[PDB]
Recover the amino acids of this structure.
């Protein structure tokens, strides 16, 4: 089996996620028409659990509502049906900041909380192509998760107090390898 090389702030194990080296570049290429119009796009990181590690095998672009600051999924039935038919786990998500810097926004933090509650290893990849930067983030666990779970603040740009999120350990939590990737587009 693959061994544990990363632990949460609460001392709980994080299984390795193997990320295809091509994924970030290919994602940017797929969503480039939106990026050029200053519109965010997201993709879902999908894959399999094998010998105590996760492997991202599919990049799935879901039905979603593009704006300059958000890219929430709309009708998830097709996403759920695709993952069901292909026996794929949700391992995280990737999205663009077409013109801004690389960080997790207020909405990104609320979005990611549900991913990371479902799977402690879940990751949020953020691409900032106009800056040529990217990052892979997670919430602090338990503290950051607690903060977002409890948050009832109004406004979609509202700030949060304290240390809420961090970059993931690489290669301890996420490791990049030369693996295959299927790109699936569920949009019209
Ligand atoms: Zn964002
Ligand atoms: Zn909040």
């Amino acid at each position: 089996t693959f061994k544990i090389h990363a632990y949460t702030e609460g001392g709980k194990p994080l299984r390795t996620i193997y990320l295809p080296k091509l994924l970030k570049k290919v994602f940017l290429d797929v969503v480039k028409p939106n990026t050029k119009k200053n519109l965010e796009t997201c993709g879902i990181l999908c894959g399999k659990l094998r010998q105590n590690a996760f492997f991202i095998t599919h990049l799935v672009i879901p039905l979603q509502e593009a704006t300059s600051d958000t890219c929430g999924t709309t009708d998830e039935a097709s996403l759920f049906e695709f993952q069901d038919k292909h026996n794929l786990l949700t391992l995280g998500w990737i999205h663009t900041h077409p013109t801004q810097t690389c960080f997790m926004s207020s909405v990104d933090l609320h979005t990611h909380c549900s991913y990371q509650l479902m799977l402690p290893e879940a990751i949020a990849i953020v691409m900032a192509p106009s800056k040529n930067t990217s990052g892979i983030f997670r919430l602090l666990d338990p503290e950051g998760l607690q903060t977002i779970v409890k948050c009832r603040k109004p406004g979609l740009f509202h700030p949060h107090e304290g240390k809420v999120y961090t970059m993931v350990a690489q290669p301890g939590h996420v490791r990049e390898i030369n693996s295959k990737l299927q790109v699936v587009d569920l949009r019209v």
Observations:
- Residues 106, 110, 148, 151, 153, 158, 160 surround zinc ion (ligand 2) (CB under 6 Å).
- The longest helix spans residues 23-36.
- The beta strands are 17-20, 42-50, 53-61, 89-96, 123-128, 133-139, 165-167, 174-177, 182-185.
- The domain at 1-188 is CATH 3.40.140.10 (Cytidine Deaminase; domain 2).
